Amino acid sequence: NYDVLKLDGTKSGSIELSDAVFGIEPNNSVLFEAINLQRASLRQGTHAVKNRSAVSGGGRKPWKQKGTGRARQGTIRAPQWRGGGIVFGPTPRSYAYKMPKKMRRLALRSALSFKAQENGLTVVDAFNFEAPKTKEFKNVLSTLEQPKKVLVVTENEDVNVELSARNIPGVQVTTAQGLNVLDITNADSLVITEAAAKKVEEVL
């Protein structure tokens, strides 16, 4: 049983959120794996070096094998040489990995449950914005007494709410579908619209 507050801050009513979705004891093990996975997926992996083959020139043997009194050498682009090819350096690759679906759903529930336990979950009746205004949204957060880092969740994409809260530092706007472990974990608080809360409960 979570109270639903109007944007003014006065209680509109009470909503029930399922214990499974917002009440399960958080699994830190699964949650860690999800956070690591999401951070890996963000990596581009566009990092490259040139090996001895790749570096320009270096075809001919620098000097005759024996008689010179020098060390035996086969190319000027060998790794010990200056301007030589790099041995086993970075190569373009992906860092993205997958995990089982059931665990993905658990990680979301665990993050959401952590929010609810810390009193980081606030339910609002609705966000109604005719036009995008950052100052108005800033007031709403002040009336709601929300912290610096806040995650605002809407049932479906709201253009005005996203536009309004875009330029406020620490504030991120998401949809129920768009909810991810990083965003929920990063945010100090989560402000969820009544419609969004139900949708999240249905999905998870």
Partner 1 sequence: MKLHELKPAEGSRKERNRVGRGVATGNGKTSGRGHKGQKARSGGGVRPGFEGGQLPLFRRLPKRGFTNINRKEYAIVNLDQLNKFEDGTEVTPALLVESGVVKNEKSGIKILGNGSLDKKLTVKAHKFSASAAEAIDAKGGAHEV
Partner RNA sequence: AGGACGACAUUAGACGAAUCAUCUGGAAAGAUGAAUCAAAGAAGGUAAUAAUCCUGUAGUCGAAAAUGUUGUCUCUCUUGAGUGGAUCCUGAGUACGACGGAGCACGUGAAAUUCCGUCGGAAUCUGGGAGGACCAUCUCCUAAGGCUAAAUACUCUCUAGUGACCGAUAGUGAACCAGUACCGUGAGGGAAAGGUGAAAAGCACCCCGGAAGGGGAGUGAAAUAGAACCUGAAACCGUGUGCU
Partner RNA sequence: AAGCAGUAAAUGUGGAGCCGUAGCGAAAGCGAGUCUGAAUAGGGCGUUUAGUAUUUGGUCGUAGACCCGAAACCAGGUGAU
Partner RNA sequence: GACAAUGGUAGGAGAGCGUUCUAAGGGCGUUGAAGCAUGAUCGUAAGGACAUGUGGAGCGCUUAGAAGUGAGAAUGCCGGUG
Contacts with Mg ion, residue ranges (CB under 5 A): 83
Residue closer to partner 1, measured from CB, 140 or 187: 187
Residue 63 structure tokens: 């000097």
Residue closer to RNA, measured from CB, 32 or 145: 32
Residues in 91-150 that interact with RNA by CB under 7 A:
95-101, 104-105, 131-135, 138, 149
- What are the φ/ψ torsions at residue 192 (nearest 5 degrees)? -115, 135
Contact partner at residue 97 from partner 1, Mg ion, RNA, none, CB < 5 to 8 Å by partner kind? RNA
CB 113 within 8 A of CB 119: no
Contact partner at residue 41 from partner 1, Mg ion, RNA, none, CB < 5 to 8 Å by partner kind? RNA
Rounded-to-integer distance, Cα 202 and Cα 46, Å: 39
- Count Cβ neighbours within 10 Å for each residue of 88-100 and write b for 16 or more, e otherwise: eeeeeeeeeeeee
Any bridge partners for residue 193, and if so which?
Answer: 124
Contact partner at residue 191 from partner 1, RNA, Mg ion, none, CB < 5 to 8 Å by partner kind? none
Does the protein bind partner 1 through residue 177 (CB under 8 A)? Answer: no
Contact partner at residue 81 from Mg ion, partner 1, RNA, none, CB < 5 to 8 Å by partner kind? RNA
Residue closer to partner 1, measured from CB, 32 or 63: 32
Q: How far is the CB of 54 from partner 1 (least distance, A)?
A: 19
Closest-by-Cβ residue to Mg ion is: 83
Residues in 4-63 that interact with partner 1 by CB under 8 A:
26, 28-29, 31-32, 35
- What are the φ/ψ torsions at residue 84 (nearest 5 degrees)? -80, 170
Residue closer to RNA, measured from CB, 123 or 200: 200
Rounded-to-integer distance, Cα 192 and Cα 151, Å: 8
Any bridge partners for residue 4, and if so which?
Answer: 13, 123
Does the protein bind partner 1 through residue 185 (CB under 8 A)? Answer: yes
Residue closer to RNA, measured from CB, 4 or 158: 158
Alpha helices (H) in the chain, listed in sequence order: 19-22, 28-42, 101-117, 134-144, 159-165, 181-186, 194-203
Any bridge partners for residue 123, and if so which?
Answer: 4, 192
Residues lying near partner 1 in the complex (CB under 8 A): 26, 28-29, 31-32, 35, 114, 182, 185-186
